[PDB]
Amino acid sequence: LITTTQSYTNSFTRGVYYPDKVFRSSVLHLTQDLFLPFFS
Amino acid sequence: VVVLSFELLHAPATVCGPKKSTNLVKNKCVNFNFNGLTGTGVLTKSNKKF
16 A cells, blocks of 8 residues: 555566558568567 | 548548448459459458458
8 A cells, every 4th residue: 555666677578569450461570660679 | 711631541441421332242353442442353252360
């Protein structure tokens, strides 16, 4: 209750979302958008 | 004075004009128009998992 202790931890490879509504299969795609950086 | 501001990006088209839909045909070279997407080709069934 009302503690809010702050500590720093690694993020690893998390935070990847579908950036469009286009179906693709067996394709390697290069996308430029807003992402959470790896290992932050 | 009134000003309109249209926009056409990658999104499901919603504000369409007044038109009448037609019955679907398959296995024939036809001119299709799906929500403003115009083209020609042959429409069949598919195994893709959308």
